[PDB]
Design a protein around this ligand. Structure first.
Ligand SMILES: O=C(CC1CCCC1)Nc1nccs1
Ligand SMILES: O=C(CC1CCCC1)Nc1nccs1
Ligand SMILES: [Mg+2]
Ligand SMILES: [Mg+2]
Lengths: 546, 546
């Protein structure tokens, strides 16, 4: 029967509420109990505070008016205000003290995900303080998780005026009794209830959630830890740069601050970073998530050498050049991991810092042809399979759904070994026609990749493997160097191909190397352990990249 | 006969040269004359410095080696090195002391513009110092102005080795005697001369330029002040955001740092900011230059109300939301100017700062229908012409070349009055079929705009004028407010439509308003006085937006 959920902000999605600082400040300065509240509410519907909540005046216009009200309130209660009493200072501290109430946000998320229309209905102000950005950021972080955010000052109405609920009901396209509305002020509930809305007086978060659990019949309290926020491709800023006449790079861009450039592996997509993209934006960074050369909406010229590391790197440099970036942090995984290491080696002036998921930095062996080197490790037999232009393409492009559903599996869910692939004559010779969907990906997520590879298929991605000799020669020019820029290596316990021990001697070449390890994590690091990944990268960026 | 120009970096495009700090440091610390040079050059072709210039080692690898060389040089000359003598410190100060040599850069520009292939040929290093970004930035600023930048450490060769000149001649696709090469070190010229290149030993910049003037037969010294760098559309990072199901905004993006969002007027384009885009990137900003709703590669839905200020603003907010920006600086001109003021008024939390070129902030008259208000000023008669859907479109879309060549004129070059346009029955009734090209724009620049408007024509742009009533009603909700966020107004002496005196009472509503004035500047502010515009905006951003 219930189809919509409405959440107050102050005292519901964000804690502590600011009327909570009103009261503390009083005790703090030993003023008359509730004096600051009287001043705040002075004149009711025609008072400074209503005119503010309605958008008639801005916050900075209201501050002196509140000063007056406190002068008048203090005069009538026969007390003096303290030396250097300041409404701006009190309200600054207050506003910046409030933080997202994680459990509530997460409950709203859950409800949204099980089909509810969610909204924030709040009395709030046009904030023009020097320090306004703080709140802007909060409001951003929150709004992206809700169908609507209705703000008193944007619509000209306030709680408890009954007109705002009519506006509410109308925005929701719902009837009074399909809505649950949670708010910390009883008065605000009063008219919601009159129209027939389920309401919840929010005191402690957990009881509110219990009532909301009981009334919606959906588990919200004590639910398992949720995944990090993902990206809807069609809500992203998509960017395009021609690095040279035939070749354009596509990227997706979110957040602001230092530039972090995300370099996916084989056979993937900018989408492989869906769980990192918001987290890093959120953490104060300018995420640029690439479609690497050969993939997605990036160009896929057919020639093999268009994909050697040197050309790939020169091209990432031009990418920075034309976008006007003097540096970026480079974070890569799988093949993208190889590339960021080579970026640190041949363009350190352009790399603020470098990090790889899974891909070790192993220097080339100048006394051993790299093809010979690769036969030395049976776990790498599939790379030989990839050599002959066309063979691997035909297997991979034959069923796209099949392919990704086969590759994109967690460690304990495997359906393919990379063992004797040449012998067997293929990657999927001994794996199902219709694989079960792994617990790591939804049906829709598989289709995304499917629709991407429909553009160019696998020639371009596969070409990344088809320059062993050219890349070796080039790498050898760098045997004299060391990586002395900040550098993080992250190993995945259960990557059976890029195994953690391959990284063991990396400190010989990267002396200040910082490390992270992820237990119980297969080869598809980002989607397998998104939470652990974000935690490791955000901590490392914060200490090494600012 | 001469077809290419090559410029050294250190001591030619960038001053002071670092061997210049080598020598000063000696005197400074009263060391043996030239001791630091011997150390620097120790072992010639097999010495630390060559291995570095060739890319065998990184800068940070070389630093201790140079320390040793200075220990050995000082021991052999029988002197002690000072307490806390430090190669890193000397070279940091040095590298960061060098600045672009404007006259040389400008000379190279000129030559490029008259058809020369230009290159930088430099001995340089893979820089991995903590402070490497400084040089990266220089190298960026410079490279964008040259066909090639060949770096010793990227190609494995150095000046004076003859192989680098062969590589040079080959990259240029030119023969020894079509090349002029200017360098500050005589030895580097030696092999250029052997192959038959015109060379120039660069001591003082002006004499070098005189020789280069004499030898190319092109004026380089004492030439008039050049325009700011422009943008080639196809070298830009182009971005796309869907703000809602039918509607996408296109923008061009350059630089990094605080987000500055550029909002063009009627009937224009992101391109109208071509002279601002590099300047601001250069000045440390993230320029986002819009195609506004209805223009260029942005959507152009046909309905009139899709273009009222409220919807336009809500849409710019969604633009920030999806791009992950909590604020941006908004800079607008003409209609874009109206919009940024309304952004400051209805979304100050999202506006870091606001600035308008030409467009005053005049608050709505709540006692006078805006159509009536517009008949009160004969200079605004053309806006009435624009009311009737279709009329203005047919005139404007009939000859696109004609239209922009007619509009885009400097003040003293006018071919149309905005006077009695209704009476006359059109904007161009009394103006030429084929106008002369104004001194403000090239033929190619006019074609760009032409090709843009071919996508949607003028319905969408014209609709911006077709919400007088709706916009008025909305504006009236804001009569109580003031703009208290940082705000710059820039008037144009010779804008005969948006005249400077229209801005006279703006301080009543914007108390901290900062002002700029441009003399001898028509309505198309950005292309008419690009240099003055960049100077005003960059100074104001630096003080009010950081
Ligand atoms: O090829 C892979 C990943 C494979 C594992 C599963 C399918 C692709 N790694 C690398 N090879 C070379 C450098 S990084
Ligand atoms: O219409 C213009 C500019 C015109 C002058 C030359 C052609 C267009 N200004 C504005 N009107 C309303 C707000 S800003
Ligand atoms: Mg509340
Ligand atoms: Mg030099």
């Amino acid at each position: 029967t219930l189809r919509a959920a409405v959440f107050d902000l102050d005292g519901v999605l964000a804690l502590p509420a600011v009327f909570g600082v009103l009261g503390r400040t009083e005790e703090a300065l030993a003023l008359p109990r509730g004096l600051l509240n009287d001043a705040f509410q002075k004149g009711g519907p025609e008072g400074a505070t209503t005119r503010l909540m309605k958008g008639e005046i801005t916050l900075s216009q209201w501050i002196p008016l509140m000063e007056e009200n406190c002068r008048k309130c203090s005069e009538t209660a026969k007390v003096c205000l303290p030396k250097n009493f300041s409404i701006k200072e009190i309200f600054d501290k207050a506003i910046s003290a409030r933080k997202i109430n994680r459990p509530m946000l997460q409950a709203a998320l859950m409800l949204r995900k099980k089909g509810f229309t969610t909204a924030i209905l709040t009395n709030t102000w046009l904030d023009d303080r020097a320090e306004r950005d703080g709140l802007a950021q909060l409001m951003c972080e929150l709004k992206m998780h809700f169908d609507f955010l209705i703000e008193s000052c944007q619509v000209g109405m306030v709680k408890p005026e009954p007109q705002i609920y009519k506006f509410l009901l109308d925005t929701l396209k719902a009837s009074p009794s399909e809505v649950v509305f949670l708010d910390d002020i009883g008065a605000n509930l009063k008219p919601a209830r009159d129209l027939g809305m389920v309401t919840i007086l929010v005191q402690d978060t957990d009881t509110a959630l219990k009532e909301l659990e009981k009334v919606t019949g959906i588990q919200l309290l004590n639910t398992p830890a949720p995944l990090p926020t993902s990206c809807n491709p069609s809500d992203m800023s998509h960017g395009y740069v021609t690095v040279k006449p035939r070749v354009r790079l596509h990227f997706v861009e979110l957040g602001s601050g230092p530039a972090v450039c995300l370099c996916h592996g084989f056979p993937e997509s900018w989408y492989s970073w869906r769980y990192q993209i918001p987290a890093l934006a959120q953490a104060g960074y300018r995420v640029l998530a690439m479609d690497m050369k050969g993939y997605g909406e990036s160009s896929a010229p057919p020639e093999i050498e268009e994909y050697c590391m040197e050309v790939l790197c020169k091209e990432m440099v031009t990418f920075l050049d034309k976008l006007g970036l003097s540096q970026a942090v480079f974070i890569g995984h799988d093949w993208g991991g190889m590339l960021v290491w080579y970026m640190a080696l041949f363009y350190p002036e352009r790399v603020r810092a470098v990090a790889s998921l899974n891909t070790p930095f192993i220097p080339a062996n100048p006394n051993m042809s790299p093809l010979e080197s690769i036969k030395a490790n049976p776990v790498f037999d599939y790379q030989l399979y990839f050599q002959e232009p066309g063979v691997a393409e035909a297997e991979l492009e034959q069923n796209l759904s099949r392919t990704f559903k086969s590759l994109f599996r967690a460690s304990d869910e495997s359906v393919l070994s990379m063992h004797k692939v040449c012998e067997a004559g293929g990657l999927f010779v001994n794996s199902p026609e219709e694989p079960s969907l792994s617990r790591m990906v939804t049906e829709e997520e598989i289709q995304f990749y499917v629709q991407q590879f429909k553009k160019s298929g696998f020639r371009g991605p596969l070409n990344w493997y088809r320059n062993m000799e050219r890349n070796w020669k080039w790498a050898c020019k760098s045997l004299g160097r060391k990586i002395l820029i900040p550098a993080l290596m992250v190993t995945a316990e259960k990557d059976f191909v890029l195994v953690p021990q391959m990284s063991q001697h990396m400190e010989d070449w990267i002396p200040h190397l910082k490390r992270g390890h992820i237990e119980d994590c297969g080869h598809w690091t980002q989607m397998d352990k998104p939470t652990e990944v974000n935690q490791i990268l955000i901590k490392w960026l914060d200490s090494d990249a600012r």
